[PDB]
């Protein structure tokens with residue numbers, strides 16, 4: 001069934017993300033702990049498709065975030081398009097802990113590490129693999145299709161970017177709604 | 184006073200690497216060789232100095248890790264407009280240790296920072312912001328600021344618009360930003 005993001009699911013996920021941040025020695029304030037965003041992308045299977053996000057700062061000039069991912073959690077394929085005169089978000093990912101499998105346009109990598117549910121494979125169209133372990137980075141230019149899945153222990157991945165406007169992101173999966181609906 | 188030598192730089196790079204490791208911040212072997220050590224041209228690295236890792240710096244944004252040994256001071260400066268570029272805006276986030284940041288405003292009584300008496304004239308802003316791990320402050324462009332780490336040192340992340348270090352304006356006319364490693 002097309003399941004639902006509940007308050008209890010959100011609380012459970014927020015607490016798990018906080019433990020992961022603490023394990024990686026990343027200090028976060030009590031106020032920030034309350035502002036960790038939990039999204040299941042409107043797909044109803046948070047532990048399959050989902051992200052736990054801390055926004056450190058986001059303004060017209062720049063943005064920085066911490067993306068926390070549970071084991072094998074997937075961020076559905078999307079891109080950050082131009083918005084009016086804004087070029088669109090460019091971002092640099094830096095893995096801080098665990099490992100993540102990032103996919104961008106290019107020649108399909110053989111034997112990719114990511115495992116996508118069979119019924120959703122149609123909504124993953126780019127297959128050039130970049131594996132990031134702690135300390136490693138990759139930069140995604142604006143309006144570029146990408147998606148990612150954490151490894152079997154999960155991941156913490158920093159974002160450094162231009163202004164973020166999540167509401168304007170374009171997803172390949174037409175079922176995705178970026179902004180959560182918590183019951 | 185001294186000149187910044189290759190040996191002093193390598194010693195400071197190694198100490199900054201150990202501090203990053205203590206804070207559990209992963210860095211690549213390539214990044215270890217690219218940590219910048221500056222004494223701002225003032226010849227007292229352990230008084231005025233910074234060890235910097237630039238994670239990324241382009242036209243759209245910049246992120247750095249600033250490592251500071253106990254009581255290292257960044258001399259007072261601002262990031263000005265450059266042509267049509269507004270100038271760098273930056274957000275600092277303390278990751279480890281503690282740092283004393285000073286910005287324009289009413290002088291704070293009993294500041295935590297300790298500055299050399301003979302350099303006081305080149306520190307002109309005195310409104311104090313203390314940042315402990317997890318805490319942040321944002322400096323608008325063309326704003327005078329300086330900072331000193333606490334008695335354990337500090338690791339302070341920067342999130343900012345494009346960085347152009349060469350165009351920074353320092354209050355101390357003795358400061359030279361761009362290195363002279365002999």
Ligand SMILES: OC[C@H]1O[C@](O)(CO)[C@@H](O)[C@@H]1O
Nearest residue numbers: 053065091159164166169178
């Ligand atoms: O909106 C989808 C998510 O994608 C990211 O850029 C990672 O690609 C996050 O900043 C964002 O919240």
Ligand SMILES: OC[C@H]1O[C@](O)(CO)[C@@H](O)[C@@H]1O
Nearest residue numbers: 235247260273341348351360
């Ligand atoms: O150049 C002076 C230094 O000041 C900072 O913005 C911190 O204020 C660093 O990015 C820079 O390297």
Ligand SMILES: [Mn+2]
Nearest residue numbers: 080091140146
């Ligand atoms: Mn993205």
Ligand SMILES: [Mn+2]
Nearest residue numbers: 262273322328
């Ligand atoms: Mn600055």
